[PDB]
Nucleic acid binder design. Structure first.
Length: 437
RNA sequence: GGCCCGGGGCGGUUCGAUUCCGCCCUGGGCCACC
């Protein structure tokens, strides 16, 4: 188990099995013939065209090249039309840029429309840079695609491989830039231990300089941060993972971490031991794309957590879970119950203009003097975290995300105790409380 | 849809709000869906 050896066994986990390779080639060729029959301009790109797709994550990306002059509406209608007559079956679901996902002879295919530009300067559709990335990458990644897969399986096996809002990790494209820059998976991990939240990797200039935030500048467009959606906490989890791996080189870093099957009974006893307040906000899942849902779930979660902290329920952490039916906003606090009364800080005895206005308010306890200023005893309209959330959510639904918020406006409940462990959140709850074993 | 920066109208809470909780407009970026 000496790094170097562990990487030899690892390839067996990230390199695609010759059967899968054929399957993909067999499909790519078919895809070609179907599109030629239509005689449309296209180009294969991504993991497949560069043969750097992670074993088991096969998916072809065909790109329909359209004239800069065409409407975005024209791309949507023409694009989807073509992709539909080209796939065995399809599925159309996207957040902003229209494309068709489907299957041809078994492999997953992404038929995406985009404008054929000259220079990836001022892109007109969200994806216009991909083809230029392919040209920039095909000549330089050649011979190091296995190195890309180690990295991809590494990030994947540790939950930070995707770059979409659900993951907020490293994009496949980022992975390939890191390899072209550092030269290998090992070199990347060796240096990633020294990355900070200000590290700027400039592939084009071949340099690493300190900056504002973590910025991996695109060879294709200097104003573009390739690691733009990589959360701070994930950059941290990676760096830390790189440090551990170099010290305890084990091929467990490439294996999909434990499935975790904890007993809903073991959990309840832990909560009892923690003596904290744990509960979720349950509402119906909005029929919308993951890329729209999660940012909203992060917002609702945060907006409620922030309410709980300023209201003194001493929040610990929050997490969210979205099943196919509902969504869950999870919380844990330190104050299961607070008092009715609390102090409110008034003016200093000095200026009376305000001292008087302060004491004029009909209070139930009569204000007192402490250290130079007046204080008042006030009563809260709720004494538990649940009560607070119930009030808050019912009253601030609109602010908890456009879609999430509207749903909560039409329904939401607060689950606690046993009734909460029956729900599909026992996995996120453990993760939240740092329960080990 | 989310984030960031800026204009203008407001409501609530507070002795005291541009400054705390929010609501309408509105201008410009950026990100995720490839």
């Amino acid at each position: 188990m000496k790094v170097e050896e562990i990487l030899e066994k690892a390839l067996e986990l990230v390199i695609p099995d010759e059967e899968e390779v054929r399957k993909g080639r067999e499909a790519e060729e078919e895809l070609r013939r179907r599109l030629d029959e239509l005689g449309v301009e296209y180009v294969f790109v991504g993991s497949y065209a560069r043969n750097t797709w992670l074993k088991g994550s096969l998916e072809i990306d065909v790109f329909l090249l359209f004239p800069e002059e065409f409407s975005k509406e024209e791309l949507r209608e023409r694009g989807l039309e073509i992709g539909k007559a080209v796939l065995d079956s399809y599925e159309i679901r996207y957040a902003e840029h229209p494309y068709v996902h489907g299957v041809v002879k078994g492999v997953e295919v992404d038929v995406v429309p985009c404008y054929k530009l000259k220079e990836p300067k001022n892109i007109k559709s969200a994806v216009d840079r991909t083809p230029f990335h392919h040209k920039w990458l095909e000549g330089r990644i050649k011979g190091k695609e296995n190195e890309v897969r180690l990295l991809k399986g590494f990030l994947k096996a540790n939950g930070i491989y995707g770059a979409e809002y659900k993951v907020r990790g490293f994009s496949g494209y980022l992975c390939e830039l890191l390899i072209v820059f550092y030269g290998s998976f090992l070199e990347t991990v060796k240096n990633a231990r020294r990355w900070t939240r200000r590290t700027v990797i400039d592939v084009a200039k071949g340099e690493v300089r300190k900056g504002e935030e973590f910025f991996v500048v695109d060879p294709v467009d200097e104003k573009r941060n390739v690691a733009a959606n990589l959360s701070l906490d994930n950059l941290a989890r990676f760096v830390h993972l790189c440090r551990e791996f170099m010290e305890a080189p084990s091929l467990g870093f490439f294996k999909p971490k434990h499935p975790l099957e904890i007993e809903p009974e073991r959990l309840r006893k832990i909560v009892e031991e923690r003596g904290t307040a744990v509960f979720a906000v349950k509402f119906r899942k909005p029929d919308i794309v993951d890329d729209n849902l999660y940012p909203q779930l992060e917002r609702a979660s945060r907006k409620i957590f922030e309410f709980l902290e300023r209201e003194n329920f001493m929040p610990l952490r929050s997490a969210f879970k979205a099943s196919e039916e509902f969504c869950y906003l999870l919380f844990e606090c330190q104050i299961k119950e607070i008092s009715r009364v609390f102090r409110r800080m008034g003016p200093q005895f000095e200026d009376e203009r305000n001292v008087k206005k302060f004491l004029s308010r009909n209070r139930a306890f009569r204000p007192f003097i402490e250290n130079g200023r007046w204080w008042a005893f006030e009563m809260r309209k709720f004494t538990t975290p649940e009560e607070g959330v119930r009030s808050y959510a019912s009253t601030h639904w609109h602010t908890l995300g456009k879609n999430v918020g509207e749903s909560i406006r039409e329904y939401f409940e607060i689950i606690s105790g046993e009734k909460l462990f029956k729900e599909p959140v026992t996995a996120e709850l453990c993760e939240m409380m740092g329960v080990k074993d």
